[PDB]
């Protein structure tokens, strides 16, 4: 059922967990570094888990897709063919920016965070800077122990702050990916849908130095030896069975002004969905003629596709449950309740008004702010602007450098510049620049930016073409030039004739001022948000509703049972899919083109000791009433005894709108069954060595 419960809320859910069927004690679960919770790791944007004492980690195919893509070429396309390292020495690097974060400690710092904020006084900008200064000092102190990375999280609008400390593994290697026609069976056609038939898994291996301390890639590194790992279920999962997930959901907005919801539904989602689809079509067309563009842009295309379909799903869901209407009515009820407490309600009423005025301020420049940011996120302009900003920040003492541009961020920046090599073709990027320039020119006068207008020198197709021709002379297209600029000083940027660099230098003062404006609005938010949000929680509580913070990338628990759902009268979705369902969707064409070994094994009813007699087949995916969001891809799904029965990977179509308004009747997790992982690795793309290492071969 509903709720992305923080670990500190365990006492409050212990009863509900037991009732739903958990057989471990709640104390066993409350040990976040013990068995089984210490097996669960964060990847940054996805979850994963250790499944062997020798550092083997399982996650979803879509979470590992970037890594697989970085190791693929047009001639040797791992996304298509899969990957299997017969011995640990055959494992390839997942890339310099790949990470496994292993939880070490959590500390409440609410009181100190709030003191630092109050010491700033009445000034909004100083308030943001106080918090940033507080965070940076706290993080620096925490990260004094080498090999750790720390993160400060704000919960419930800034009513609570917790510091997480994680062991930061920096040498992550790809151990196994099934072929893409299994790992992403059904592609974008089945994405966000049930029935689903997707083998959404892949394996990494975590490495550390010989001293046991995290290190970057090196052939002298050895497998990390985790304190805890998960074991596969020995009992068959069935309909009605208890399941729970631990993971790192990224963002929800169930606590939101109606006007925030309205802006998102009517502008933000449709705008982004449209831009993503326009860019998908260009890259798709270009890749049909050029297999290098096809492979190098595959990971980018996967996100554009996933995000734009998610946004379409939300808009449809909003219309299905009248979300606008629910947001309006709820807000009116809360404002009513506040007015009826007289004096005591006044500060939440005032905060509401302040939040609403801040939303209007950001609304006034939204077309500009979005268009500029996505224009600047094409490969060469993004590189130029990032690197030129780093050169500005390096002249300051580290403690005053913008977050993202401190010494602790240098590894990531550097890695990003190398990874780009496998994600950039000039002729493709030029079409993307052109798209963004064309969109820029359609902006009205009051949303334009002098520096870009000037650089463009014109307002028509001929000007667009002349800027593109100028930008094409950049040298930032090679990895070696990008790294040269990574180490260079500000004066060297300001002297360059590289036209991408020249653009960056010209627009930088504008980006910095827009940034200050955003930090200023953010400081007024720091004052107003906690007060309104605490009032929303208090009201939810007086209505007897579940109270838990919106997602924010930290560790949460959700629990429930295996069950289907009913999308319309006269029909139901069943909780499982089966092998025979996979073959029934076969067409021989991407994305419905299973490996011939899969088709042969199913026709021959080779079930591999994994059949669930109750469904007559090996199960493939299943549905459950857990409450997950982006970031939970890859999370282990545990049964009553804390054994692995699956991985979380998707939601059904009707579920995605629960990001704003939760609907219990059609919100389900889609997970891939542990037995289908094992089946694929026995009968279709064999990895006997991995099955042995996890004691199931």
């Amino acid at each position: 059922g509903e709720g992305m419960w923080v670990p500190q809320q365990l006492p409050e859910i212990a009863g509900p967990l037991k009732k739903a069927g958990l057989k471990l004690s709640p104390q066993q679960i409350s040990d976040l570094t013990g068995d089984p919770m210490g097996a669960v790791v964060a990847l940054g944007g996805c979850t994963a888990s250790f499944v062997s004492p020798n550092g083997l980690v399982v996650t979803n195919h879509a979470c590992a897709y970037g890594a697989i893509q970085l190791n693929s070429t047009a001639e040797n396309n791992l996304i298509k063919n899969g990957f299997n390292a017969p011995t640990t020495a055959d494992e390839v690097s997942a890339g310099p920016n790949a990470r496994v974060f292993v939880l070490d400690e959590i500390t409440d710092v609410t009181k100190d965070a709030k003191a630092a904020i109050a010491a700033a006084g009445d000034d909004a900008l100083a308030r943001t800077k106080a918090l940033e200064a507080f965070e940076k000092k706290l993080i620096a102190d925490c990260e004094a122990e080498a090999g750790f990375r720390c993160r400060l999280y704000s919960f419930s609008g800034g009513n609570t702050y917790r510091l997480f400390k994680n062991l930061e593994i920096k040498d992550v290697r790809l151990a196994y990916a099934p072929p893409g026609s299994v790992g992403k069976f059904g592609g974008d056609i089945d994405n966000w849908m049930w029935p689903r038939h997707t083998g959404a898994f892949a394996f990494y291996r975590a490495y550390v130095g010989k001293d046991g301390k995290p290190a970057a890639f090196s052939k002298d590194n050895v497998p990390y030896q985790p304190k805890h790992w998960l074991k596969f279920a020995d009992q068959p999962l069935g309909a009605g069975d208890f399941v729970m997930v631990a993971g790192y959901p990224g963002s929800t907005n169930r606590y939101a002004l109606a006007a925030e919801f309205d802006n998102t539904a009517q502008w933000t989602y449709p705008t982004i969905a449209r831009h993503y689809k326009n860019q998908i079509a260009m890259v798709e067309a270009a890749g049909k003629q050029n297999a290098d563009i096809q492979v190098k842009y595959a990971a980018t295309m996967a996100g554009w596709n996933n995000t734009s379909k998610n946004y379409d799903g939300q808009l449809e869901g909003f219309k299905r449950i009248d979300a606008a209407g629910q947001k309006l009515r709820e807000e009116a009820a809360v404002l009513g309740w506040l007015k009826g407490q007289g004096a005591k309600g006044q500060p939440a009423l005032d905060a509401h008004a302040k939040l609403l005025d801040l939303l209007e301020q950001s609304k006034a420049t939204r077309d500009r702010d979005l268009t500029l940011a996505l224009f600047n996120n094409t490969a060469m302009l993004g590189s130029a602007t990032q690197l030129y900003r780093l050169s500005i920040e390096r002249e300051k003492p580290n403690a005053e450098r913008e977050s993202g541009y401190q010494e602790r961020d240098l590894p990531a920046i550097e890695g990003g510049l190398k990874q780009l090599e496998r994600r950039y073709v000039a002729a493709m990027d030029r079409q993307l620049q052109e798209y963004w320039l064309n969109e820029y020119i359609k902006l009205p006068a009051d949303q334009r930016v002098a520096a870009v207008d000037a650089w463009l020198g014109g307002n028509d197709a001929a000007a667009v073409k002349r800027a593109l021709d100028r930008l094409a002379g950049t040298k930032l297209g090679s990895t070696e030039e990008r790294l040269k600029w990574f180490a260079a000083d500000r004066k060297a940027f300001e002297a360059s004739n590289d036209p991408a660099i020249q653009y960056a230098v010209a627009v930088m003062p504008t980006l910095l001022k827009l940034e200050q404006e955003r930090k200023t609005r953010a400081g007024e938010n720091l004052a107003a948000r906690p007060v309104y949000l605490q009032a929303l929680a208090d009201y939810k509580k007086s209505q007897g509703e579940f109270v838990y913070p919106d997602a924010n990338l930290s560790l949460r628990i959700t629990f429930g049972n295996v069950m289907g759902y009913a999308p319309k009268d006269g029909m139901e979705y069943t909780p499982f899919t089966t092998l025979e369902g996979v073959v029934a969707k076969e067409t021989g064409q991407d994305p419905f083109d299973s490996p011939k070994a899969l088709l042969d094994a199913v026709a021959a009813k080779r079930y591999g000791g994994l059949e669930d007699k109750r469904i007559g087949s090996v199960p493939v995916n299943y549905l459950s009433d857990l409450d997950i969001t982006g970031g939970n891809a890859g999370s282990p799904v545990l049964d009553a005894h804390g054994k692995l029965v699956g991985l979380a990977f998707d939601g059904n179509w009707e579920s995605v709108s629960s990001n704003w308004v939760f609907d219990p009747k059609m919100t389900r997790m889609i997970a891939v069954d542990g037995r289908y992982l094992r089946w694929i690795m026995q009968e279709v793309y064999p990895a006997p060595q991995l099955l042995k290492e996890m004691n199931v071969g």
Binding site: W192, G250, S251, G630, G631, A633, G651
Partner: peptide, 6 residues
């Protein structure tokens, strides 16, 4: 696919 969006 429930990967983190941005």
């Amino acid at each position: 696919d429930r990967v983190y969006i941005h």
